[PDB]
Amino acid sequence: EVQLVESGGGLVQPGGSLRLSCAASGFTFSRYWMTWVRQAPGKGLVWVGEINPDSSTINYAPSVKGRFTISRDNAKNTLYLQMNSLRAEDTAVYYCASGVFTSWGQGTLVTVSSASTKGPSVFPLAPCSRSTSESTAALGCLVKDYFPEPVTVSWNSGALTSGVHTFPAVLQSSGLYSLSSVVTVPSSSLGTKTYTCNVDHKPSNTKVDKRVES
Amino acid sequence: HKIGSLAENAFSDPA
Amino acid sequence: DIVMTQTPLSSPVTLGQPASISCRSSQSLVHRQGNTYFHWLQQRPGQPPRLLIYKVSNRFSGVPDRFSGSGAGTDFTLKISRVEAEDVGVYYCSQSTHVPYTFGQGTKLEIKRTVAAPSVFIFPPSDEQLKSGTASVVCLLNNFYPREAKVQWKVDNALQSCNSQESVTEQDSKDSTYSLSSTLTLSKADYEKHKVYACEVTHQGLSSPVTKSFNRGEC
Numbered sequence: 283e284v285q286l287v288e289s290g291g292g293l294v295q296p297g298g299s300l301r302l303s304c305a306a307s308g309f310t311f312s313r314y315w316m317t318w319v320r321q322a323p324g325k326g327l328v329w330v331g332e333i334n335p336d337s338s339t340i341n342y343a344p345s346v347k348g349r350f351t352i353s354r355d356n357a358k359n360t361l362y363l364q365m366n367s368l369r370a371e372d373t374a375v376y377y378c379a380s381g382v383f384t385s386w387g388q389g390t391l392v393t394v395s396s397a398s399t400k401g402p403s404v405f406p407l408a409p410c411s412r413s414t415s416e417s418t419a420a421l422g423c424l425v426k427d428y429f430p431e432p433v434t435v436s437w438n439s440g441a442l443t444s445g446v447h448t449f450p451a452v453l454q455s456s457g458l459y460s461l462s463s464v465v466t467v468p469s470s471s472l473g474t475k476t477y478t479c480n481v482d483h484k485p486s487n488t489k490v491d492k493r494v495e496s
Numbered sequence: 497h498k499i500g501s502l503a504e505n506a507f508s509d510p511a
Numbered sequence: 512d513i514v515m516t517q518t519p520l521s522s523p524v525t526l527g528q529p530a531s532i533s534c535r536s537s538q539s540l541v542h543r544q545g546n547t548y549f550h551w552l553q554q555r556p557g558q559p560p561r562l563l564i565y566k567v568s569n570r571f572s573g574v575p576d577r578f579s580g581s582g583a584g585t586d587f588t589l590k591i592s593r594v595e596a597e598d599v600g601v602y603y604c605s606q607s608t609h610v611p612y613t614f615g616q617g618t619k620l621e622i623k624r625t626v627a628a629p630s631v632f633i634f635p636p637s638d639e640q641l642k643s644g645t646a647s648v649v650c651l652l653n654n655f656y657p658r659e660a661k662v663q664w665k666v667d668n669a670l671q672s673c674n675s676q677e678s679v680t681e682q683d684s685k686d687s688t689y690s691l692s693s694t695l696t697l698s699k700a701d702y703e704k705h706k707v708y709a710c711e712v713t714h715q716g717l718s719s720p721v722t723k724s725f726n727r728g729e730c
Binding site for chain 1: 512548550552554559560561562565571603605607610611612613614615616617630632633634635636637639640643647649651653654676677678679680690692694696725729730
Binding site: 283284308309310313314315317332334339341380381382384385 | 508
């Protein structure tokens with residue numbers, strides 16, 4: 283399987299520097315041009331640049347020329363993006379791709395901000411008891427007061443996916459993010475399993491598994 | 497001068 | 512640099528019917544005396560983009576026949592013939608005839624499905640949270656269509672303003688519905704001053720608004 287595994291993202295202060303990596307397997311990386319593209323939260327795709335197999339041609343977007351450097355190490359099958367003089371407008375998910383968009387990495391979010399990292403609080407969401415039958419029952423987790431993005435949420439270690447909705451985070455008036463993840467199930471099945479939300483916030487070294495009881 | 501679009505494998509599936 | 516112009520939202524397309532998305536470039540995309548490097552990409556939420564059509568009309572790997580491309584010079588169209596629910600997402604045009612390569616703003620494909628009323632749930636603040644000085648009350652509107660919905664918070668029947676925030680999911684890839692959360696944030700002190708907490712939901716699929724409520728302490 284072609285894999286493009288990216289790393290190096292996270293929080294960086296304005297004016298600072300960060301180096302992203304994109305490691306390739308499943309194809310002869312040394313024979314392909316490689317590409318960086320970025321996408322600011324909620325916005326469209328923006329091309330960052332490309333590099334040819336032997337590194338003798340490197341083309342850059344005007345918005346990054348003179349601040350970013352693209353390179354590659356074919357012996358390690360790895361593509362790099364060295365970013366200097368970072369600004370808030372550079373906050374984005376950074377993707378690598380082979381050729382002209384023929385295979386893509388998962389993306390890594392770079393947040394350019396002066397704020398500190400803050401880990402989330404995880405609270406259960408469970409309704410009050412009901413006295414009229416309803417076709418589904420709901421439970422969830424409120425993941426409140428974290429910075430920067432992203433948090434990831436799974437249920438029962440990724441075994442529970444049907445009926446799950448993890449909402450896009452919102453920025454609160456405090457400057458911290460919050461989101462909820464909910465799961466709804468057919469009501470008579472509610473008691474047939476347990477429900478644990480697995481919350482991971484890498485910037486704060488936070489990993490929480492919260493059992494939610496109705 | 498050279499751009500990736502003109503590479504022989506620009507649009508080939510790497511798989 | 513070459514500007515690529517496409518609209519942000521498609522007309523709602525019914526399952527099994529065709530959708531067309533167009534893009535215009537600010538100059539010809541014919542490279543010198545050769546190919547036209549105009550492409551279409553598809554992006555689903557939380558996923559990277561995927562190449563769909565390259566060089567105007569060539570389907571990329573794993574792209575089925577319902578996606579086709581046409582056009583020439585500065586005007587191009589993607590046709591999705593028999594739309595499926597899984598086709599929901601954002602479609603970008605792209606040129607790579609000249610550097611910097613550029614993209615359109617993205618056109619979101621919206622699927623038109625039957626009206627579906629939301630299932631509504633209200634979640635009181637957890638005892639864990641209350642021990643910390645803040646109270647969050649959450650109202651969930653699950654699996655509804657169309658996207659427009661009105662949510663009002665009433666605390667002892669008094670309308671709340673300026674203390675809630677909403678989040679809405681993207682259209683679901685299986686049932687083509689939306690879900691929405693509204694979160695009311697109060698100080699613990701203000702939360703203990705009142706008894707009845709209610710979320711009231713108005714939506715095309717409901718003949719009368721739906722209210723879900725609880726009484727502080729009763730749970």
